[PDB]
Design a protein around this ligand. Structure first.
Ligand SMILES: CC(=O)N[C@@H]1[C@@H](O[C@@H]2O[C@H](CO)[C@H](O)[C@H](O)[C@H]2O)[C@@H](O)[C@@H](CO)O[C@H]1O
Ligand SMILES: [Zn+2]
Ligand SMILES: [Zn+2]
Length: 401
């Protein structure tokens, strides 16, 4: 048996903003109850996509935490780099606490490497009051009807869409992937096709918007993006569901009481489906000496539903219903937005991510930014991703058809 006190470290990249139940305050509850398993949680200092590079540095060092946040999209990559610990015999005990889809996303080859934490269905945020002022009385459901509406808004200095070049890897992959995967294993080899009907539909949608000057082009994480919500010019956009409290903070309050969440329209060849953008597991890393207790704490952590929801998460836990915080429904015109997130989740297409997808995402972002001044086409996002996907798999020493 272990000694009396086991010490566990947990690195996460949860927002921890004002108004939220801070992770350390969540962990303090556990620590008080469990002197036998003491937990130290720390928030990664840096840009989200850099976290797994730090984990890689730290695994090789032997200064890694026991537990770290790992995106579903990042799991096959960090797995392939040998950063994870097979914890199947422990995962199996907690399996029933979690929805079956997210639980399958912590597995590689029928072994489990942690526990799912949340999901990232793409939805549409919009200011309903501002739509009304523009005579937009319905969320337009076809790409053509949306583009027509967006030109009308644009001529009044308003935008019902944003193009986010720094998020093309995560958001635009999800939107295209809503209608079919880009990657599959066929026997001995990966088969890559990132130029699906969905990719073509998605490209055409954003291309028409950009050519009409009818979408903002501020990078999502730049102060210019918050400025667009604050100044009232950005009145509609695709968003991952976990964006809700972020968006609310970014706004400064502008539109409070008027914002609403809708399902994505059929704008991306998505035909009634949505796609994933983010959503993460927490993984047990290669050389953790305490997998059992790490997983014991993690099952507790990932079932603190109201506290996770405070961080904007759509929890993977099925142990209790997630509920819209009062603050959020207020901001969103009294709407129970969590019901929208759950609907979106249930309509979210599966998407296998190749190992090395970080490189595909990084390239997508780079090529996405070329489109904002007309130097590049939106479509080039998908043709470049195809080449980077194939090259990255080959760099990993993996076979590609
Ligand atoms: C795919 C990805 O990593 N996207 C980044 C965001 O990550 C999401 O974060 C929320 C927490 O707010 C949640 O953990 C979700 O599972 C994640 O996918 C996020 O860090 C964002 C900055 O707020 O940047 C995105 O790039
Ligand atoms: Zn205890
Ligand atoms: Zn132990």
């Amino acid at each position: 048996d272990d000694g009396g006190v086991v010490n566990i470290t947990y690195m996460h990249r949860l927002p921890d903003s004002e108004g939220m139940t801070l992770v350390n305050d969540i962990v303090a509850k556990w620590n008080k109850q469990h002197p036998d398993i003491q937990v130290k949680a720390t928030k990664f200092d840096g840009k989200a996509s850099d976290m797994i590079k730090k984990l890689e540095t730290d695994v090789k060092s032997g200064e890694a935490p026991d537990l770290a946040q790992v995106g579903y999209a990042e799991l096959p990559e960090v797995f392939t780099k040998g950063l994870l610990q097979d914890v199947t015999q422990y995962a199996e005990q907690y399996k029933n606490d979690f929805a079956s889809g997210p639980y399958s996303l912590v597995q590689v080859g029928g072994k489990a490497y942690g526990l799912p934490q949340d999901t990232g269905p793409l939805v549409y945020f919009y200011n309903k009051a501002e739509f009304e002022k523009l005579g937009i009385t319905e969320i337009p459901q076809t790409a053509d009807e949306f583009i027509a509406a967006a030109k009308t808004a644009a001529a009044a200095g308003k935008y019902i869409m944003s193009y986010q070049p720094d998020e093309a890897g995560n958001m635009i992959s999800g939107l295209a992937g809503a209608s079919g995967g880009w990657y599959k294993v066929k026997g001995d080899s990966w088969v890559v096709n990132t130029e699906t009907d969905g990719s073509k539909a998605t490209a055409d949608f954003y291309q028409q918007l950009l050519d009409a000057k009818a979408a903002t082009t501020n990078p999502r994480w730049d102060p210019s993006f918050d400025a667009s919500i604050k100044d009232g010019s950005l009145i509609g956009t695709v968003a991952a569901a976990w964006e809700a409290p972020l968006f609310m903070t970014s706004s400064g309050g502008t539109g409070s009481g008027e914002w609403q969440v809708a399902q994505l329209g059929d704008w991306f060849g998505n035909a009634g489906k949505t796609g994933p953008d983010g959503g993460s597991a927490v993984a047990v890393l290669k050389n953790s000496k305490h997998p059992k207790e790490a997983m014991e704490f993690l099952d507790w952590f990932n079932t603190q539903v109201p506290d996770l929801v405070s961080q904007g998460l759509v929890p993977a836990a099925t142990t209790e219903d997630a509920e819209t915080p009062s603050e959020w429904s207020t901001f969103f015109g009294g709407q129970d937005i969590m019901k929208e997130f759950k609907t979106a989740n249930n309509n979210m297409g599966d998407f296998t991510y190749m190992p090395g997808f970080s490189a595909v995402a990084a390239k997508m972002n780079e090529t996405a930014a070329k489109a904002t001044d007309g130097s590049g086409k939106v479509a080039d996002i998908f043709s470049d991703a195809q080449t980077t996907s194939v090259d990255t798999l080959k760099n990993f020493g993996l076979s590609v058809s």
